[PDB]
Amino acid sequence: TYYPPSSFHFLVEFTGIDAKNNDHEFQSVSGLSVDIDTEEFAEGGENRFKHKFPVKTKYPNLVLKRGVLVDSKVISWCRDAIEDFEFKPIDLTVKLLNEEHQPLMTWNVVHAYPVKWSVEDFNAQESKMAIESVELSYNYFKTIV
Amino acid sequence: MITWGSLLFKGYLKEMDIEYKLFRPDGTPIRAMATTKIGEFVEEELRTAQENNQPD
């Protein structure tokens, strides 16, 4: 913009999981990008370049981090998939906020489910917070702005 | 007759493959690769002189 916005003020909301204020707060969000797979072809007589063709649109997994929370609803949902193969996809909204705490821009993440859950190593000789990490697979996203 | 250095071989062609690789924009070829197989020929009067067959 004339002065572009910073990246440290944002909100993560879930649809299909009971809401709690402690499940909307995260330390970091990553994975909001996309790419197109292509193929190459050489045409006889054309020596200046090879041709390139698109094939598929590709998205990476969405990664969320925060300090450990013991009564999380999101984690209970993750456990049902992890332990029993019960899968029930959800939708999600990522919001980048302005100074009035209203959205500048949002991302609509469609049909997501859990593929990973972990907690970082313990160390008796270091002063650190216990950090939790969750990774989700989804089909695509759209933006609103 | 095929000659290169120490090599000297007489015979006939059996097999050939030619593959065309690069072209000018109007379709003129400028690069190609060829694979070849040659058999061996001996005339029958020379075979009995090389097999100097000798109780007879």
mmCIF file of C-alpha atoms in Angstrom:
data_model
loop_
_atom_site.group_PDB
_atom_site.id
_atom_site.type_symbol
_atom_site.label_atom_id
_atom_site.label_comp_id
_atom_site.label_asym_id
_atom_site.label_seq_id
_atom_site.Cartn_x
_atom_site.Cartn_y
_atom_site.Cartn_z
ATOM 1 C CA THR A 1 0.000 0.000 0.000
ATOM 2 C CA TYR A 2 1.547 3.390 0.604
ATOM 3 C CA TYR A 3 2.691 1.921 3.921
ATOM 4 C CA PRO A 4 2.246 -1.889 3.783
ATOM 5 C CA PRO A 5 0.797 -3.670 6.888
ATOM 6 C CA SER A 6 2.786 -5.699 9.391
ATOM 7 C CA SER A 7 2.288 -9.423 10.019
ATOM 8 C CA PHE A 8 2.029 -9.779 13.826
ATOM 9 C CA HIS A 9 -1.739 -9.334 14.398
ATOM 10 C CA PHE A 10 -4.060 -12.154 13.249
ATOM 11 C CA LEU A 11 -6.846 -14.621 14.257
ATOM 12 C CA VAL A 12 -7.543 -18.354 13.495
ATOM 13 C CA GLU A 13 -11.171 -19.582 13.624
ATOM 14 C CA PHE A 14 -12.624 -23.055 13.172
ATOM 15 C CA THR A 15 -16.047 -24.182 11.897
ATOM 16 C CA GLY A 16 -17.509 -27.485 13.133
ATOM 17 C CA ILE A 17 -15.641 -27.567 16.469
ATOM 18 C CA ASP A 18 -17.090 -26.098 19.690
ATOM 19 C CA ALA A 19 -15.575 -22.673 20.244
ATOM 20 C CA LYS A 20 -13.334 -21.671 23.139
ATOM 21 C CA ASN A 21 -11.320 -18.468 23.270
ATOM 22 C CA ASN A 22 -8.142 -20.394 24.035
ATOM 23 C CA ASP A 23 -8.307 -22.259 20.717
ATOM 24 C CA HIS A 24 -8.271 -19.094 18.605
ATOM 25 C CA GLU A 25 -4.875 -17.859 19.750
ATOM 26 C CA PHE A 26 -1.689 -18.929 17.994
ATOM 27 C CA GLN A 27 2.004 -18.093 18.037
ATOM 28 C CA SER A 28 2.505 -18.685 14.304
ATOM 29 C CA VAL A 29 0.676 -19.663 11.071
ATOM 30 C CA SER A 30 2.283 -20.943 7.860
ATOM 31 C CA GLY A 31 1.466 -22.617 4.542
ATOM 32 C CA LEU A 32 -0.809 -20.108 2.777
ATOM 33 C CA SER A 33 0.619 -20.490 -0.731
ATOM 34 C CA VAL A 34 0.093 -22.329 -4.084
ATOM 35 C CA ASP A 35 1.924 -23.622 -7.235
ATOM 36 C CA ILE A 36 1.250 -25.132 -10.688
ATOM 37 C CA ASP A 37 2.838 -28.368 -11.899
ATOM 38 C CA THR A 38 4.017 -28.241 -15.510
ATOM 39 C CA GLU A 39 5.397 -30.475 -18.308
ATOM 40 C CA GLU A 40 7.961 -29.809 -21.022
ATOM 41 C CA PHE A 41 8.039 -30.532 -24.771
ATOM 42 C CA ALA A 42 10.613 -30.015 -27.521
ATOM 43 C CA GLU A 43 9.247 -29.164 -30.959
ATOM 44 C CA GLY A 44 11.449 -30.084 -33.887
ATOM 45 C CA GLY A 45 12.693 -26.974 -35.679
ATOM 46 C CA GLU A 46 12.160 -24.648 -32.754
ATOM 47 C CA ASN A 47 15.581 -24.106 -31.151
ATOM 48 C CA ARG A 48 14.922 -20.990 -29.086
ATOM 49 C CA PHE A 49 13.024 -22.591 -26.177
ATOM 50 C CA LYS A 50 11.057 -25.603 -25.018
ATOM 51 C CA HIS A 51 7.311 -25.462 -24.562
ATOM 52 C CA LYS A 52 5.788 -25.672 -21.102
ATOM 53 C CA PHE A 53 2.279 -26.747 -20.211
ATOM 54 C CA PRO A 54 0.293 -26.601 -16.941
ATOM 55 C CA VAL A 55 -1.093 -29.784 -15.416
ATOM 56 C CA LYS A 56 -2.272 -29.285 -11.772
ATOM 57 C CA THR A 57 -2.685 -26.753 -8.978
ATOM 58 C CA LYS A 58 -0.879 -27.715 -5.762
ATOM 59 C CA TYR A 59 -1.204 -26.577 -2.101
ATOM 60 C CA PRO A 60 1.045 -27.245 0.971
ATOM 61 C CA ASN A 61 -0.225 -28.253 4.422
ATOM 62 C CA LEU A 62 -1.296 -25.609 6.943
ATOM 63 C CA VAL A 63 0.876 -25.414 10.076
ATOM 64 C CA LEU A 64 -0.142 -23.922 13.440
ATOM 65 C CA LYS A 65 1.985 -23.378 16.590
ATOM 66 C CA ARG A 66 1.228 -22.328 20.191
ATOM 67 C CA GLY A 67 2.110 -22.988 23.830
ATOM 68 C CA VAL A 68 0.710 -26.258 25.230
ATOM 69 C CA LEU A 69 -2.997 -26.149 26.160
ATOM 70 C CA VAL A 70 -4.334 -29.172 28.054
ATOM 71 C CA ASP A 71 -8.165 -28.948 27.472
ATOM 72 C CA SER A 72 -8.188 -28.013 23.738
ATOM 73 C CA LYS A 73 -11.195 -28.916 21.558
ATOM 74 C CA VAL A 74 -9.030 -28.941 18.458
ATOM 75 C CA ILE A 75 -6.785 -31.559 19.973
ATOM 76 C CA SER A 76 -9.753 -33.781 20.931
ATOM 77 C CA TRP A 77 -10.788 -33.599 17.264
ATOM 78 C CA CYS A 78 -7.238 -34.483 16.184
ATOM 79 C CA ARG A 79 -7.174 -37.491 18.522
ATOM 80 C CA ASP A 80 -10.365 -39.030 17.069
ATOM 81 C CA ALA A 81 -8.723 -39.075 13.637
ATOM 82 C CA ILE A 82 -5.274 -40.146 14.910
ATOM 83 C CA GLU A 83 -6.387 -42.967 17.205
ATOM 84 C CA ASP A 84 -9.581 -44.328 15.584
ATOM 85 C CA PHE A 85 -9.528 -43.275 11.872
ATOM 86 C CA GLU A 86 -12.659 -41.224 12.414
ATOM 87 C CA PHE A 87 -12.368 -38.372 9.962
ATOM 88 C CA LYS A 88 -14.674 -35.354 9.861
ATOM 89 C CA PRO A 89 -13.250 -32.431 7.828
ATOM 90 C CA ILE A 90 -13.764 -28.801 8.913
ATOM 91 C CA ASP A 91 -13.482 -25.349 7.426
ATOM 92 C CA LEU A 92 -11.225 -22.646 8.718
ATOM 93 C CA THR A 93 -10.683 -18.894 8.449
ATOM 94 C CA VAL A 94 -7.381 -17.048 8.700
ATOM 95 C CA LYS A 95 -7.737 -13.323 9.364
ATOM 96 C CA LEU A 96 -5.105 -10.595 9.013
ATOM 97 C CA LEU A 97 -6.245 -7.636 11.157
ATOM 98 C CA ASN A 98 -6.114 -3.820 11.136
ATOM 99 C CA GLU A 99 -5.839 -1.337 14.060
ATOM 100 C CA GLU A 100 -9.605 -1.510 14.771
ATOM 101 C CA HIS A 101 -9.149 -5.257 14.982
ATOM 102 C CA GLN A 102 -11.203 -5.809 11.849
ATOM 103 C CA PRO A 103 -9.969 -7.894 8.870
ATOM 104 C CA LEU A 104 -7.712 -6.367 6.225
ATOM 105 C CA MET A 105 -7.851 -9.617 4.328
ATOM 106 C CA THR A 106 -8.970 -13.184 4.962
ATOM 107 C CA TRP A 107 -8.282 -16.703 3.685
ATOM 108 C CA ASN A 108 -11.023 -19.316 3.349
ATOM 109 C CA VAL A 109 -9.531 -22.785 3.889
ATOM 110 C CA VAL A 110 -11.769 -25.584 2.607
ATOM 111 C CA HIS A 111 -12.269 -29.196 3.872
ATOM 112 C CA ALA A 112 -9.345 -29.606 6.306
ATOM 113 C CA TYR A 113 -8.330 -32.574 8.483
ATOM 114 C CA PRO A 114 -5.403 -33.501 10.825
ATOM 115 C CA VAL A 115 -2.253 -35.252 9.606
ATOM 116 C CA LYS A 116 0.242 -34.427 12.352
ATOM 117 C CA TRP A 117 0.575 -33.561 16.066
ATOM 118 C CA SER A 118 3.696 -33.073 18.176
ATOM 119 C CA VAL A 119 5.264 -31.470 21.247
ATOM 120 C CA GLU A 120 8.900 -30.291 21.390
ATOM 121 C CA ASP A 121 11.614 -32.033 23.466
ATOM 122 C CA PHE A 122 12.012 -31.561 27.201
ATOM 123 C CA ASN A 123 15.353 -30.386 28.597
ATOM 124 C CA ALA A 124 16.162 -30.289 32.311
ATOM 125 C CA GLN A 125 18.964 -27.764 31.798
ATOM 126 C CA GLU A 126 17.132 -25.116 29.745
ATOM 127 C CA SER A 127 14.514 -22.477 30.567
ATOM 128 C CA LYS A 128 11.844 -22.846 27.887
ATOM 129 C CA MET A 129 8.099 -23.023 27.301
ATOM 130 C CA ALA A 130 6.508 -26.265 26.146
ATOM 131 C CA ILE A 131 5.423 -25.777 22.516
ATOM 132 C CA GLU A 132 2.730 -27.686 20.636
ATOM 133 C CA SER A 133 2.432 -28.065 16.842
ATOM 134 C CA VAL A 134 -0.492 -29.127 14.602
ATOM 135 C CA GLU A 135 -0.508 -29.725 10.838
ATOM 136 C CA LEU A 136 -3.633 -29.931 8.617
ATOM 137 C CA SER A 137 -4.309 -31.119 5.063
ATOM 138 C CA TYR A 138 -6.936 -29.218 2.993
ATOM 139 C CA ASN A 139 -8.203 -29.070 -0.601
ATOM 140 C CA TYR A 140 -7.858 -25.417 -1.599
ATOM 141 C CA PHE A 141 -8.335 -21.891 -0.422
ATOM 142 C CA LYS A 142 -9.998 -18.694 -1.617
ATOM 143 C CA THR A 143 -9.375 -15.128 -0.548
ATOM 144 C CA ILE A 144 -11.688 -12.299 0.391
ATOM 145 C CA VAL A 145 -10.559 -8.681 0.253
ATOM 146 C CA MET B 1 35.999 -52.857 -47.811
ATOM 147 C CA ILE B 2 36.334 -51.052 -44.471
ATOM 148 C CA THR B 3 39.745 -49.630 -43.526
ATOM 149 C CA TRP B 4 40.877 -47.587 -40.524
ATOM 150 C CA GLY B 5 44.418 -47.900 -39.202
ATOM 151 C CA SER B 6 45.030 -51.562 -38.409
ATOM 152 C CA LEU B 7 41.497 -52.617 -39.387
ATOM 153 C CA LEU B 8 40.637 -54.198 -42.753
ATOM 154 C CA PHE B 9 37.296 -55.968 -43.230
ATOM 155 C CA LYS B 10 35.382 -57.260 -46.282
ATOM 156 C CA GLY B 11 31.694 -58.066 -46.401
ATOM 157 C CA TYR B 12 28.162 -56.806 -46.718
ATOM 158 C CA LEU B 13 25.644 -54.718 -44.859
ATOM 159 C CA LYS B 14 22.938 -56.442 -42.822
ATOM 160 C CA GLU B 15 21.260 -53.748 -40.701
ATOM 161 C CA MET B 16 21.010 -49.979 -40.380
ATOM 162 C CA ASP B 17 19.070 -47.447 -38.287
ATOM 163 C CA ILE B 18 19.206 -43.663 -38.830
ATOM 164 C CA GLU B 19 17.680 -41.185 -36.351
ATOM 165 C CA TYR B 20 17.353 -37.457 -37.130
ATOM 166 C CA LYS B 21 17.890 -35.083 -34.204
ATOM 167 C CA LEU B 22 18.215 -31.337 -34.996
ATOM 168 C CA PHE B 23 16.580 -29.245 -37.708
ATOM 169 C CA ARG B 24 16.694 -25.763 -39.159
ATOM 170 C CA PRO B 25 13.356 -23.831 -38.994
ATOM 171 C CA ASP B 26 12.515 -24.747 -42.610
ATOM 172 C CA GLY B 27 13.033 -28.452 -41.893
ATOM 173 C CA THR B 28 16.629 -29.012 -42.980
ATOM 174 C CA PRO B 29 18.386 -31.596 -40.769
ATOM 175 C CA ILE B 30 21.775 -30.801 -39.249
ATOM 176 C CA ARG B 31 22.400 -33.788 -36.944
ATOM 177 C CA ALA B 32 21.875 -37.563 -37.198
ATOM 178 C CA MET B 33 23.063 -40.839 -35.640
ATOM 179 C CA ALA B 34 23.545 -44.195 -37.407
ATOM 180 C CA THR B 35 24.029 -47.778 -36.157
ATOM 181 C CA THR B 36 25.435 -50.431 -38.488
ATOM 182 C CA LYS B 37 26.047 -54.202 -38.648
ATOM 183 C CA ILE B 38 28.405 -55.831 -41.189
ATOM 184 C CA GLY B 39 28.776 -59.494 -42.133
ATOM 185 C CA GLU B 40 31.895 -61.216 -43.429
ATOM 186 C CA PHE B 41 32.595 -62.468 -46.959
ATOM 187 C CA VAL B 42 35.114 -65.074 -48.139
ATOM 188 C CA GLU B 43 35.265 -66.253 -51.749
ATOM 189 C CA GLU B 44 35.283 -70.041 -52.088
ATOM 190 C CA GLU B 45 38.553 -70.264 -53.961
ATOM 191 C CA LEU B 46 40.280 -68.417 -51.140
ATOM 192 C CA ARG B 47 38.700 -70.578 -48.417
ATOM 193 C CA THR B 48 40.403 -73.747 -49.658
ATOM 194 C CA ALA B 49 43.739 -71.917 -49.929
ATOM 195 C CA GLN B 50 43.478 -70.737 -46.313
ATOM 196 C CA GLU B 51 42.370 -74.202 -45.154
ATOM 197 C CA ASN B 52 45.462 -75.930 -46.525
ATOM 198 C CA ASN B 53 43.900 -79.346 -45.974
ATOM 199 C CA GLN B 54 46.447 -82.151 -45.904
ATOM 200 C CA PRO B 55 47.156 -90.090 -45.644
ATOM 201 C CA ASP B 56 46.185 -88.017 -48.714
#
